[PDB]
Design a protein around this ligand. Structure first.
Ligand SMILES: c1ccc2c(CN3CCNCC3)cccc2c1
Lengths: 1032, 50, 100, 50, 49
């Protein structure tokens, strides 16, 4: 098949240029992103029940939806959390690789089945299903330049919604805009004391608002069916809704025949404000707003980010002068840096292989061929990667950088073999190509197939590991497939074409090049003699080799496991949790001190702070901070995120109002709110809330005292004092007070009631009624409220309600339908996560019967990964065995070659242990590609060894000669791969942890597979063919 | 009207016309909410009746 | 009986604003007439199955439903396929041509 | 020859699809603003007669 | 027009726009691919020209 192309070079040239042209024509549609959708597809339900307690919302709304979403296709689990703020959060997680559109529509279908049961308040407010985790491209923020504290965030938010959000959501590529704040709304702050003075109840003001602020579909006179006479139809356009606070204050509450009237403004203060005050956002000590922009599926990131930034800057021209925009977080900058570095490593590795190519062959034309055949393979790799719908993310760029090595060998060995024949027989380029390719082509097919099937299994595994290995392994595999195809067809034509004849006997050379030829001749002869010296002693080398494999196993089992190394993402998590029952103002003061201290830190460029939200849970006492770090180029190691987190935790260790905790972000977005382990403490039997909290303190005492874990804290809101209202229903009724009046009055005065729609200049926002700030600040204010009796007088609440304090849940957490506690933490440094999981299982076994435990997200996927790795390795090994017996027409030769991989594993294990990296996915793939290189090396020795030993050469002589004439390309490709991946292990900056975990593992494994493999492989050959007594 | 004048006067096109309904006279109903209320008339009654 | 502007800012505006960001949008046209019929046409790129377009638009109308007036809801919102392979139109008419 | 080809290729007016005789037509009946259905029916009567 | 009044194309005009955009590099890709197949078949470049 190669000879077909040697006789017809243009055919091979055209095929290669064809695949290259395809590659070029496929980039302009490349999808790019930080990482692929490694996190599972999560759908999240947001139901709002204003003024409903945590338990009320738990048993009234979220429980019903939870009941309905059971049994959905592709469920993985589902978490719910009901906060005292009246927002219910339900996160339904599915297996990764499932289309999020189908998950979304199925969840909407089940939400509809549930919809008949939620209260009227939630329904009129609306239930929202979206995608909490996705390729959130960036977050853009608006803030006030002057840093005025009295800044009305509501006007800023209204400007953002009317002018900015619509434009950005209009942009190409963006699949969802998440405005992370409230919306304008006419607020009706009623004063119940004025209502008392005027003999008015809160239901009266609500009904006045409801009937007087309504649009009027009046119609048009002269309408069809019209008289045969009239001819002038026209619209009636009655004005019914009210536009500004002045109009709303003119709503008549009670008007007499004489003319006296009671208008709403006389009892309530009317203004336009936030529909909801649960959440507040601050950016660098100034009241700010922000939105989360998420990338649509199958779209470029860099183009989308540039479009968003250009659009936003264009809008900044029309911005109010007091307000300014800035984009603190951008997930496309990481990819731009990543591809710009990977392209640099690719070019600089091409230059290194060119340099050593020319150092060995001392002629440029010989060296040129691989430099043309390689990028052809890379372009084909892009085309096929796009065809299956993979994305250009960091992991495919590592597919690139560590493909380049295994890909380059095909050209290296082919051109180096053609040179060896050209030198030792001196034929013309064409017949020399015929001879060399006839020697090597069957071996090349064996290579292509065997590495195809060595990274084929890595594509079978499921989970988030499943996605990582999918992309990275399949990029590798497509690379090697096209590399083998080129070595079969195109590169031999390249040798037959570009190579120039050499004079006979021109081994004498001028300059240091002649020194090189002499010294490599000496090295090859010395190694030849070395083989000749060890091949008689094969049984004795067994003991060294077995020491090597045993050491491999020993430090491999001593190697702590890990999922993914934590990367410096340039941002941190700081949690602001105050004691139970903390007002927003205390949290704002704590956030003020925190943000000031972050100003004092030079490692931080901008600090974005959220009030009312924290990964522990949403509430008034809770807040979160996302400091943004400076660019890596402008920072050193001493200002790394971990060191800065330690600095903050030490600084705010003696904070007097609440707790401040700095946690580095989880390595994989969407798999959790922090790294480490996630455990849900269930109550599979219904022991009760108090019993569940008892089990919670039990497990936390048994865990935090165990030095195996760094920490473990309830990722959730602590129980808070509550004010139960003891309403004597009988007493209230006797005074003529309906329970409906009390319930309505309490709901509207303290929980705020949304009455009807405010038609705010084209936007349908909701008028909200709530009691005055001064009239709802104390428990006595609850009693001072009045309700109407049947006789028309107003009854004070204190006449029939006595307030008794008790303690209750501010946040209720349920998992797979049962009440649960969310306990999270990280293991002690230098301690494996699997051992911590085992310790946690052991401790949870000591819990009282009925308390279940369940892993979630990161822990569950670590579990399935650790489960799958073993039979993954087994299937890989058995398939390579089968392909080897296919190619070698033997069994002894297959075991002979398969003896090679423990040396590469030993190299990788020793290198990673010396640098101390864990057994992450990146090291695992580095190991498998090192194994692939070692296998390529072993074949490159043994196919020629078999060829000689079938030609009449003695077993020892055949092996030694085979090693002699395969020594040069062996160390050749070894050094090329060395210097190509050395930048990976020394990588610093964005994504550097992954690149280093690659580089060290690959460098060490391939270092051993070369230094130890080249000596041991002929020894293995002679042993296996002797002990089994194989015959040619 | 600006663009339509700039276009219909330009001989490059047969015509340009709003594929849409022209503005029509309307009959606003000025309801004195205060007056109606004093006579004892709710806005709900007026809105429902109309 | 709702005017053009009333229907504009009360019904078609809310559905219009909410259907943005739907997958495969090419644009969307809305027109509100004094007759009380709101008309919104959402166009997708050719080659997309209109079943998926229809279901996504129904799911978005669902999110919109919470805001429409009671009159529209009791009368009901309808989504269909304005352009398709309309095979024919068939008609019934009176032979005698009576106007009454 | 190739230059001539280019010269009348760039002189060739573009089009999407030629209009086919589909056997039907569009006639629009728009009356002044505020027109009752009966005026439109009279206009349609005269149109249909013609 | 006064600043603030945007214009957009719809339906037929939008499709005509994208068609006029794509025609050129469509022709180009066709020509380069036929050239490549022709050099493949003829084992030459001169014959393809
Ligand atoms: C800066 C600001 C927000 C960030 C988020 C948003 N979070 C998810 C949605 N809920 C709000 C918090 C995620 C990750 C990094 C960030 C960095």
């Amino acid at each position: 098949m190669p000879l077909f192309f040697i006789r017809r070079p243009n055919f091979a040239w055209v095929v290669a240029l064809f695949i290259s042209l395809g590659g070029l024509l496929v980039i302009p549609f490349l999808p790019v992103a930080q990482y692929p959708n490694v996190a599972p597809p999560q759908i999240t339900v947001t139901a709002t029940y204003p003024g409903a307690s945590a338990q009320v919302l738990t048993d009234s709304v979220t429980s019903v939806i939870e009941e309905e979403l059971n049994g959905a296709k592709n469920l993985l689990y589902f978490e719910s959390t009901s906060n005292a703020n009246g927002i219910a959060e339900i996160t339904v997680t599915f297996q990764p690789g499932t289309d999020p559109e189908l998950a979304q529509v199925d969840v909407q279908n089940r939400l509809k089945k549930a919809e008949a049961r939620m209260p009227q308040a939630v329904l009129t407010l609306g239930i929202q299903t979206e995608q909490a985790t996705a390729g959130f491209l960036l977050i853009y923020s608006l803030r006030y330049k002057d840093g005025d504290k009295n800044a009305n965030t509501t006007a800023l938010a209204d400007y953002a919604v009317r002018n900015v959000n619509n434009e950005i959501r209009r942009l190409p590529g963006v699949g969802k805009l998440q405005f992370f704040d409230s919306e304008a709304a006419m607020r009706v702050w009623i004063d119940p004391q004025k209502l008392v003075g005027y003999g008015l109840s809160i239901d009266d003001v609500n009904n006045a608002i409801r009937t007087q602020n309504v649009q009027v579909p009046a119609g048009a006179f002269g309408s069809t069916p019209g008289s045969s006479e009239q001819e002038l139809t026209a619209t009636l356009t009655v004005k019914g809704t009210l536009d500004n606070p002045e109009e709303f204050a003119a709503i008549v509450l009670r008007a007499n025949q004489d003319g006296s009237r009671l208008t709403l403004g006389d009892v309530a203060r009317i203004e336009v404000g936030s529909q909801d005050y649960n959440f507040g956002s601050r950016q660098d000590g100034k009241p700010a707003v922000a939105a989360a922009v998420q990338l649509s599926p199958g779209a470029n990131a860099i183009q989308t980010a540039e479009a968003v930034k250009q659009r936003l800057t264009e809008l900044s021209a029309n911005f109010p002068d007091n307000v300014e925009f800035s984009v603190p977080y951008d997930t496309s900058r990481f990819v731009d840096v990543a591809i710009d570095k990977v392209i640099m490593t690719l070019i600089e590795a091409m230059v290194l292989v060119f340099l050593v190519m020319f150092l060995f062959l001392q002629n440029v034309r010989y060296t040129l061929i691989p430099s043309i055949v390689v990028p052809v393979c890379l372009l084909g790799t892009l085309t096929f990667m796009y065809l299956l719908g993979f994305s250009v993310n960091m992991m495919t760029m590592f597919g690139m950088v560590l493909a380049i090595g295994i890909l380059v060998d095909d050209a290296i060995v082919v051109v180096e073999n053609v040179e060896r024949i050209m030198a030792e027989e001196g034929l013309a380029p064409v017949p020399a190509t015929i001879k060399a390719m006839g020697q090597v082509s069957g071996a090349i097919i064996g290579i292509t197939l065997v590495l195809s099937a060595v990274f084929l299994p890595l594509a079978f595994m499921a989970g988030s590991v499943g996605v990582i290995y999918q992309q990275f392994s399949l990029s590798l595999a497509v690379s090697i497939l096209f590399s083998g195809f080129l070595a079969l067809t195109f590169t031999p034509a390249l040798c037959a074409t570009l190579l120039k004849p050499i004079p006979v006997g021109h081994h004498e050379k001028t300059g240091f090049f002649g020194w090189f030829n002499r010294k490599f001749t000496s090295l090859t002869s010395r190694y030849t003699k070395l083989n000749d010296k060890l091949v008689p002693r094969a049984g004795r080398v067994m003991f060294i080799y077995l020491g090597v494999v045993v050491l491999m196993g020993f430090l491999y089992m001593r190697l702590p496991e890990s999922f993914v190394p934590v990367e410096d993402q340039g941002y941190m998590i700081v949690d602001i949790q105050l004691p139970p029952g903390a007002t927003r103002e205390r949290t704002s003061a704590a956030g003020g001190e925190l943000e000031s201290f972050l100003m004092a830190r030079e490692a931080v460029q901008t600090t974005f702070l959220v009030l009312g939200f924290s990964f522990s849970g949403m509430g008034e006492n809770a807040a979160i901070a996302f400091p943004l770090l400076k660019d890596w180029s402008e920072r050193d190691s001493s200002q790394s995120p971990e060191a800065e987190s330690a600095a903050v935790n030490q600084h705010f260790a003696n904070l007097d109002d609440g707790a401040i905790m700095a946690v580095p972000p989880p390595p994989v977005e969407g798999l959790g709110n922090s790294g480490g382990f996630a455990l849900r403490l269930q109550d599979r039997a219904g022991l009760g809330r108090d019993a569940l909290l008892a089990a919670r303190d039990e497990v936390l005492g048994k865990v935090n005292g165990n030095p195996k874990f760094l920490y473990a804290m309830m990722e959730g809101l602590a129980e808070a004092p509550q004010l139960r209202l003891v309403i004597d229903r009988e007493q209230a009724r006797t005074l003529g007070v309906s329970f409906e009046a009390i319930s309505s009055a309490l709901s509207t005065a303290f929980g705020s009631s949304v009455i009807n729609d405010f038609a705010n200049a084209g936007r349908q926002q909701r008028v909200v009624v709530q009691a005055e700030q001064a009239e709802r600040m104390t428990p006595e204010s609850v009693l001072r409220l009045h309700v109407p009796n049947d006789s028309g007088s107003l009854v004070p609440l204190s006449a029939f309600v006595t307030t008794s304090w008790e303690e209750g849940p501010v946040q209720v957490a349920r998992y797979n339908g049962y009440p649960s506690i969310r306990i999270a933490g990280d293991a002690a440094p230098g301690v494996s996560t699997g051992e911590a999981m085992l310790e946690l299982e052991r401790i949870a076994a000591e819990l009282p019967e009925g308390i279940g435990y369940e892993w979630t997200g990161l822990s569950y996927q670590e579990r399935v990964a650790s489960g799958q790795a073993t039979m993954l390795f087994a299937l890989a090994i058995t398939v390579v065995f089968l392909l080897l017996v296919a190619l070698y027409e033997s069994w002894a030769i297959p075991l002979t070659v398969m003896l090679i991989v423990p040396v590469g594993a030993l190299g990788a294990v020793l290198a990673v242990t010396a640098i101390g990296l864990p057994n992450d996915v990146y090291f695992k793939v580095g190991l498998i590609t090192v194994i692939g290189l070692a296998a390529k090396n072993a074949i490159l020795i043994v196919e020629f060894a078999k060829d000689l030993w079938e030609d009449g050469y003695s077993l020892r002589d055949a092996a030694v000669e085979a090693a002699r004439l395969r020594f040069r390309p062996i160390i050749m490709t070894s050094m090329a791969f060395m210097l190509g991946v050395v930048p990976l292990a020394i990588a610093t900056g964005a994504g550097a942890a992954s690149q280093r975990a690659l580089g060290t593992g690959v460098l060490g494994g391939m270092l051993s597979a070369t230094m130890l493999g080249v000596i041991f492989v002929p020894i293995f050959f002679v042993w296996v063919l002797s002990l089994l007594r194989t015959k040619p």
